[PDB]
């Protein structure tokens, strides 16, 4: 399936990621006033990575072709699992830590210490760990970050057969690049998909957290991020 170029995908991934990859450590977060408060930093990082998420979407084969409202739909209900898998893959280059888009590493200790340990550990053991123990390249990431983008089952989709069209095209390109580049392991294309249910659950649990700091938390949430979350 040449219609969906893996090169546009990887190129879209490559366009996204920063050009200056420097990292600092975050304090143990015991005060919402420190320049390194964990909770607060992730929200600063998600606002940022939400903007760039838009462009990453655009630079994905055919997404610009879609109706303006079907674009927003697919994003509105996807940004979550999008940004998640992004940083999961990104953080494979370190152990027991998470690398932020704001250029800030977040240890597993600063997590538990800031109450959100449990979910952190689930990301580690379900996404990151899993990816590492399978060498998934940025192109494979891209195909997955794309398939999430093409969730035909969205509620309010003006054309659920059209969006399901694109997702079957990527289904092709991906199984192609896999059985192609990684011939020794046949069932590699599927190995990659196994992480999807997990990303969902993880996406859902992550939401709750986000709702919680809004509702309760003094935690300062910002613009782009704020708008993405609106469900009782």
């Amino acid at each position: 399936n040449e219609d969906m170029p893996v090169e546009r995908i990887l190129e879209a991934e490559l366009a996204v990621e920063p050009k200056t990859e420097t990292y600092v450590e975050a304090n143990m977060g015991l005060n919402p006033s420190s320049p390194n408060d964990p909770v607060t930093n992730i929200c600063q990082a998600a606002d940022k990575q939400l903007f760039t998420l838009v462009e990453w979407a655009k630079r994905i084969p055919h997404f610009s072709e879609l109706p303006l409202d079907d674009q927003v739909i697919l994003l509105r209900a996807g940004w979550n699992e999008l940004l998640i898998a992004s940083f999961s893959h990104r953080s494979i280059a370190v152990k027991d830590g998470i690398l932020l888009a704001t250029g800030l590493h977040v240890h597993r200790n600063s997590a538990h210490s800031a109450g959100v340990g449990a979910i952190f550990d689930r990301v580690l053991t379900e996404l990151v760990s899993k990816m590492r123990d399978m060498q998934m390249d940025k192109t494979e990431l891209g195909c997955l970050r794309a398939i999430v983008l093409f969730n035909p089952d969205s509620k309010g989709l003006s054309n659920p057969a059209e969006v399901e069209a694109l997702r079957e095209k990527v289904y092709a390109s991906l199984e192609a690049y896999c059985k192609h580049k990684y011939p020794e392991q046949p069932g590699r294309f599927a190995k990659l998909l196994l992480r999807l249910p997990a990303l969902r659950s993880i996406g859902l649990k992550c939401l709750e957290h986000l709702f919680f700091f809004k509702l309760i938390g003094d935690t300062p949430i910002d613009t782009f991020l704020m708008e993405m979350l609106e469900a009782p």
């Binding site: 655009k58 303006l68 509105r76």
Partner: peptide, 10 residues
């Protein structure tokens, strides 16, 4: 959805 709309356009 103010912000989201503007970006998908420009």
């Amino acid at each position: 959805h103010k912000i989201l709309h503007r970006l998908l356009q420009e």
